[PDB]
Amino acid sequence: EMVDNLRGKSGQGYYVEMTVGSPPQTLNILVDTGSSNFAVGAAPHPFLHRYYQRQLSSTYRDLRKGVYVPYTQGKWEGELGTDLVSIPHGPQVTVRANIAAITESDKFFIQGSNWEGILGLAYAEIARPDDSLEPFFDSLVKQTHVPNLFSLQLCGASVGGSMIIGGIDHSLYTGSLWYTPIRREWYYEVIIVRVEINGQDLKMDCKEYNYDKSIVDSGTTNLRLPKKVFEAAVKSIKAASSTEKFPDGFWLGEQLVCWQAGTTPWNIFPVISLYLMGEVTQQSFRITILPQQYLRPVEDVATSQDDCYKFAISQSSTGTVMGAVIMEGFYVVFDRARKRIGFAVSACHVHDEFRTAAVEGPFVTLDMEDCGYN
Template sequence: MTKMLLYVVFLFSFLVTVLCSEDYNLYGDAGQAYAIEVFLGHPAQKLNVLVDTGSTTLAIATYPRQDNNEYFHFDNSTSINDSGKEIQAKYSQGMWLGRLASDYIQFPSLPNLPEVRTDMALITKSHKFFMNGSSWQGLLGLAYLPVGAWGDHLIVESWLDSLDRRLKTPSSFELKLCGVKSSSNATHYGNFRVIDDAVETYETIFRTPILRKRWYEVGVLSMRVMYLKQPNMTSVPASTKNSQENYVSTDLNIEMCQQLNQEKSIVDSGTTNIRLPDDLYRQVVDELKNAVLSSNILILDEFWYHAEAACWTEPQNWSLPWLAIDLLSTESDQEYFTLELPPQNYMRVVSARNNTSENGTVPEFCYKLGLEAGGKETVLGYTAMEGLQVLFNRSAGWIGWQSSNCGPNARITGPYNVTTSIRAACQLNKVISDGAMSIKAAQWTLCIISIIAAAVLIYLLAPCIKMMLMKPLPASNQISLSQAALVQQDST
């Protein structure tokens, strides 16, 4: 009887664990973004591709690389349609050359999604694109069509556009990026899901508008270092309304806002760090560096300015300032909200292992700064997304942010109001691209304009053509009634 009772308790605990636990379908090694498993072709070949909101094209390796012999054997797929036409893409780091093809793709972790045929790039050559030891074989672009791969007179459709056409309804997607499971583990994990806009009901969520539908371009209003008034933040909720009482905050800095959006500000899951304009990057890093010095933590300058790792024999429990990122709200042109990121977001774990030395096995825990200089552009890489759930509503044109049940203790506060137009003050009033307007639509528009111009030209030249084709008639002494009336009126 006792054994039976123990068995029932064990079975119940097991079922509760299975039913209550969440399945994560995104994984990645340190500094390599988040990858998802896909099946390509018929018969299906299992590969891993990065989920990338900073590009559009599904691009797959077709050859072995250094430290990675896995790739797509397209010759083994009976459903491949290889056009043989050359395409290419260039990223902020790296580039590739390849051919345009189409084949079937399926996501084993998303059984509710149908298998669809989609365009893809068969990568034949690359430069600084695949990192050594990377566990992924390609890229799943999730942005809009204008930032897809290009070729001569070619349009490369994205997987999301293919999916929308198959479902006959627009789809959104959500990224829940959890970061590392612990300070002694460098592998990060998360969840990717596709949402049907027609049936999904959204809970309380902070939304920022997509200013231009190429990348996911948003209005980043400021980047601030936030100092704690109280050291214990465990009692602070992850997402609050009008609550910043535990922080010293500053008003919206219009000059900084213009600097952040001078070129573009995008949300990019394919980029690791938060990229800031050079001057602002140095300002933020200097402030963080001074905070570290005042806390008696020894970190060399190479860590802050040259992307070098800092290592310790034990995992670090950081008690450093938080970072605050202000984003324009969709609710009002005079409203914004704030992403508040703890130091666990920007002090990234890049190595957690036992190192063998002459004195035996020595544990080594290494970290890198999750900030970098970006020239004139601003990029919110996945460092700014960990600990949050980020919903990309492509058709409605907004990105939603809410707290997460995994990852760093990141939170969202607001909304906050200002007295002037944020778009005008921060110079965010750029030309907004229609979501339905793609390269193909632009080509059709150009074609229609050409036809109309030709028709107008023919209409204007018609009298001349008619005179050339018709024989001249003898002169006549008759005049029209209108001419006679004018002559008569002049003579009186």
Template structure:
């Protein structure tokens, strides 16, 4: 009996090791997902946000009013500080610092070696670090053109340093699980790195959208709408437009107008942004429908919550019965195909406070929520609100982002692929895909070269008479020239 029980005990341990997933991303309510990093020798442990909306690894190197935890550069024996000033500006916040390099290691990424890479040591910031934030910097995962800048300075990225060290391109995956429970506002997830050759062998169906330009992770967002049965929504899907084209041309035109509006400036996937940010017109349409759905279900929520980012609070946690938000994305399989992310209300009705306050008067519960949508002027940003409950794989070298449902977090769904009768790139006036950043740089170099040649040719043409007169003048007897040079001059003169 004892031996049997012992066998069961060891079997339980083995199963637990096999199926218990290790998460390395954590964050407090309203903040993005942070990853633990080791910088310098001796190692200093810090937390950095994983940010697909920028490129630079930037960490605080000074004490702030709300936090005394920062990178102490004087304690690292491996730090190389160039002293050159660099800076960065984000949609919210700015910082100024110095360019340095040091050894960086992520202990939770077993397959990624310690590498020396560029680091921006932040010395001053404005509205960058949030009050009470548990992180000291951010890890930029985008392409080089959206890194920090300075005069005659190019700031490299950690990802590029890893690829150079391993001598192969790398992909990364974000599995964002959201909050742990209805009564806990802390969210968690997992960050993984892969050899690009391994991404094709990953299990499960992966829906892929192309990266249209390799700066940010810029993609084609075709529509953002309320996901309800057909004929019940005023903002229906592209699929319904296709099937009702002859009787609903005005709706078709509205879809095309919306699609162009969504991509007018740029549409990006940004894990460093919290909300789904939409152009003003699209934001108003989507929120109006959500508000109407809430009123229909007798849910009283003030307009300040829907339109002005104010929190709404209840004495108990809420289980939302609102419709999902559908996001149509261009597919890599064909120019006339797309697939749809269905984002449940548990994603965009974001919990910001979940606590029970015990005092002299007894226990007082407070569960507060904010809307995970915001107006963004002309740009579209799919923040982590659109990624929770999904596994999002970024294949940088191949130029695509893969989406599939996750085994943790909200029950987000993906449907498709859906077909359309014409090119969606043309319909929505999307930017044509660019194979690589180097293409743009080479194009600019060739353009400058061509301009220089044309300018030189014009200058030579204008100065030709003067040059000709100077060349045919008799040379002083004392000047020595070779016969070949003299012959050349004479040939040109004749």
């Protein structure tokens, strides 16, 4: 019943079906671990197939307060209110929640995305206009008997996956679940203790990996890195892939790379290993990312004699973001109750006949430095 309740298009986010209001209005809502506002289109927009019509809901209540939310990509404004909300292919509950009714936006909605709103699944501390605006998942836990946990299985033109609310579906992963502590309940903030490119350590003070935070964000496409880590990573991947030479704009996300259909040279690209802080002192585990994840395919029938890709690793001035291209092929458990994040290899794991994505541990370390930036 909850398995395969997510759809999407590549680079455009993953969405679940929801209803808002009485009687219920059906909307597709992008799943975002990287924010904390539930918001839906509530006025006509060229890219919106449908929108929330507050005048048709008897349960709607205006809070008489505006809100503005700018993200890394896009922004919107609107009006706070509350209403009844359900998730048809989720738990069978109806909850009264805070809803921002988007009445104006800029570069937020995406042409042909199939979604009309966003579900911020992070904590109150980053909610706008402030932490008194109770996020949806908190409302759900408080009002129903749903356990304080959800899991995401994102799979890689159209895509799919599963959001499991209130527990863990063993059928969605193989091997062991490894847990990294949530350092601070605002974003799902975690700590990276080491980065290797094709087995070779980037040899940087580990605080750099976390300048000025590291988050797990289903609402952001790319792996985003602080400039210093980004520069060092690109150098290493360039070196590893030097059998071919790409335009500088490729590495900067300004240009596709294309190969004749079926001939993508996966093997010239390295594996990236991210080591996450363990639940025990100086211990860690690693998740390993194949180029099939960080070279994001760009579907376009005009270019379809070729397979074409964008480099899905980019530079950040606000810390590390482990985005959807990193999450895909892992089963990720947001165990809010025990303040930790679990990673396991998922049922839709990425792999060819030579290499596979993995979650492996434990790794131990002599160095007693705390890797947290602040």
